[PDB]
Amino acid sequence: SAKEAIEAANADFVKAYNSKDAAGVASKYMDDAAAFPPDMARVDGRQNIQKLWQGAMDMGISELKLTTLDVQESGDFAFESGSFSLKAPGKDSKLVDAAGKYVVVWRKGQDGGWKLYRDIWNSDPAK
Amino acid sequence: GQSAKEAIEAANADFVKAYNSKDAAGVASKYMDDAAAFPPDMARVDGRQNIQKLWQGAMDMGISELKLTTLDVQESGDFAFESGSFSLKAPGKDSKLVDAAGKYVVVWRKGQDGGWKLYRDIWNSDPA
Secondary structure, three states: OHHHHHHHHHHHHHHHHHOOOHHHHHOOEEEEEEEEOOOOOOEEOHHHHHHHHHHHHHOOOEEEEEEEEEEEEEOOEEEEEEEEEEEEEOOOOOEEEEEEEEEEEEEEOOOOOEEEEEEEEEEEOOO | OOOHHHHHHHHHHHHHHHHHOOOHHHHHOOEEEEEEEEOOOOOOEEOHHHHHHHHHHHHHOOOEEEEEEEEEEEEEOOEEEEEEEEEEEEEOOOOOEEEEEEEEEEEEEEOOOOOEEEEEEEEEEOOO
16 A cells, blocks of 8 residues: 555664664655755755754654654655654753654655655654 | 646635634635644644634734745645745744744645645744
8 A cells, every 4th residue: 555655665764764874864765855844944855854864863863763644645646644753862861752743745756666755844742 | 727736826815814814714714624734842633623723722822924935836636735934923932922934835635626725734943
């Protein structure tokens, strides 16, 4: 299913992020993708997206987890919404849990593989 | 013939008019029944009625003067996606109104009645 395909791509994404492989993460995006991080300007293109994720790693963001909630397929696009969790150091240096939510526009390449095309997220309160 | 991008522009005009009229029902009416909104620092909001409540809450907090700028629209049959920017006046940490700006992505869907409606609506802030 396209939902299963996106879940597979997300498994690879998480593995690369948690292995501290910023190039690996960026490779899951289209070369002309864009990311929309909270409190930062829009980030365009795979190389700048690598720098974004490297920055996350450098700030101690770790143990990323993604849960796909729903996917709608539409031709060469698929629309995914989901939740995330992660850990990041507190002022105390102690790792604090954080969660949030996202929407991704995925695009299907000529080689048949789904890749991230627009990636936007923000934070949720603890529950 | 009217294009998807034209229909989306007319819908966005409807949206901003309703918001700035403090008409939360009017704003929520632009969403699909099974839409979801993704407000920063709040839980995901699912369904039109709850989306109304979300916007009513923004209004009750005093958030005002909504301006939207569409930067890209791509169509895909009975779906489309839009990215853009917003600006508004919102109470700051001291409760005084200040300029706030940010970016958004909307996944749009064409309903059975031909009407383009928001299906996923997510946004966040730009840096100062």
